[PDB]
Design a protein around this ligand. Structure first.
Ligand SMILES: O=C(O)CNC(=O)C(=O)O
Ligand SMILES: O=C(O)CNC(=O)C(=O)O
Ligand SMILES: [Fe+2]
Ligand SMILES: [Fe+2]
Lengths: 273, 273
């Protein structure tokens, strides 16, 4: 296994194969510079007012996050293939700013899926329990604490010791590149030994039958109405389909998004006039 | 293993032991006749307007369900012990009326947990994935299709064939008795060979890290404010605690019920005056 950096236009099949073999990869130019700047602009004061800062609530705080980032075609292409065959639908798990102040120490090496009790029942050949997209806002370098990964460690059995620090491979990214982190990949933020902060931000998704880290039930109705149907489902506003007519997150026997009136209906002609 | 019928005042420890050994049991007088009648009164028109009827949405349709039944001390005593050590919090999964018209045929024998993909990873010695309380509204008899169980079948390995029909043990209940059905117990409704309908209703609960069959996000704010804090958590209005400060269903980094203003605050003295 190896850390691969692939162009945006790499076929989805090839990315899935790299994930299976190596457990992680970087997609270059995952976001353009416009999206990097709009996200920075929308979150920068929230981060400063928040040596590690990880504020979440990103769909509430960032219109670009809820209207654009969560529709990202690479996220959905990967998630449909990782979760679809086994579970059906998937939805958003959590997502935060990943901000390292100058002087921050190395983060403990971990698997993101450790907080699922069912990770103890899972085998390394089973689908992952969650998947994270870690997108660079600043450059990620060795010296500023860019995330480090241990390619192949997603295949280790449960209870395997963490990789040694010397086994960790730093991920070198320009603003807008993204690191893909299945829940089984061992990884960690590095130490920021520079005088400038290192910042990225994440999305993550997991099967529809697992409860997200973050609810979005507190978001204003008006924000929910500006989301696409897909993002409404990602953020907990729609009923979820398993397989063969099995649904969870139902309003009684019907769909939540019908019961809440979230789905658009046509006005009566008289009301329009 | 045997089907046991126990009095309401049976110690919780003894009920948990019976569940472990036999996989099911009946608690007599689980509800009093007042609660049976109030639930019937609140749902009867909804059932008739709905040879098997299983309408859900019970917290919306029944004040007694959301204000009284979901606070039932036996449900919480069992669920805390079944789910607490492994997962921390639990919450409501689904609950419907269980109505058999005269002439209905025997229901396929099943385990309730089959729709969880992770039931394939679980072992019979692991905690159940869900637990159901099936409460009699009418009497449950052999002839009217009272639920049947196969004591001990919760310990069978995954992929074991269903019990034979001749192995099924009918559950004979008076109005207000309750049958306890862990997700691993094989069971089914029987045929209603009488001229009168047979009706019960259910609650069910499962670990906080799994997505409920039913959302309650469509319920009016005013109904949510009349629930106890416990029932608010049961029905998806509160952040959920795993272990060692891990939470899911958070509003950002804080609690959902704070972000929505669901938790009562004291008015300003001037506003009160
Ligand atoms: O910030 C980083 O580079 C990596 N962070 C994490 O893996 C995390 O917080 O789970
Ligand atoms: O209605 C009954 O007696 C039993 N019903 C079920 O087990 C069910 O619908 O899952
Ligand atoms: Fe991580
Ligand atoms: Fe059942």
């Amino acid at each position: 296994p190896q850390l691969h950096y692939v162009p945006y236009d790499t076929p989805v099949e090839d990315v899935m194969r790299i994930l299976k073999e190596s457990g992680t990869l970087v997609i270059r130019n995952f976001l353009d510079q416009n999206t990097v700047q709009k996200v920075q602009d929308e979150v920068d004061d929230y981060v400063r007012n928040w040596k590690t800062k990880q504020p979440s609530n990103l769909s509430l705080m960032s219109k670009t996050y809820r209207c654009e980032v969560l529709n990202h075609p690479w996220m959905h292409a990967i998630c449909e293939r990782m979760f679809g065959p086994t579970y059906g639908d998937y939805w958003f798990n959590g997502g935060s700013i990943l901000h390292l102040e100058p002087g921050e120490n190395t983060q403990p090496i971990h698997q993101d899926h450790v907080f699922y009790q069912i990770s103890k029942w899972r085998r390394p050949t089973d689908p992952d329990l969650t998947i994270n997209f870690t997108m660079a806002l600043t450059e990620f370098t060795v010296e500023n604490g860019g995330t480090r990964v241990c390619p192949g460690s997603h295949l280790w059995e449960n209870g395997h010791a963490s990789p040694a620090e010397e086994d960790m491979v730093p991920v070198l990214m320009q603003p807008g590149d993204a690191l893909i982190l299945p829940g089984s990949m061992w990884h960690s933020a590095g130490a920021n030994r520079t005088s400038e902060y290192r910042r990225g931000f994440a999305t993550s998704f997991h099967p529809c039958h697992f409860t997200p880290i973050e609810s979005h039930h507190h978001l204003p109705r008006e924000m929910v109405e500006e989301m696409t149907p897909l993002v409404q489902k990602m953020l907990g506003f729609r009923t979820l389909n398993l397989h063969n007519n099995v649904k969870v997150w139902k309003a009684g026997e019907g769909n939540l998004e019908d019961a809440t009136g979230l789905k658009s209906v046509a006005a009566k002609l008289a009301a329009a006039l």
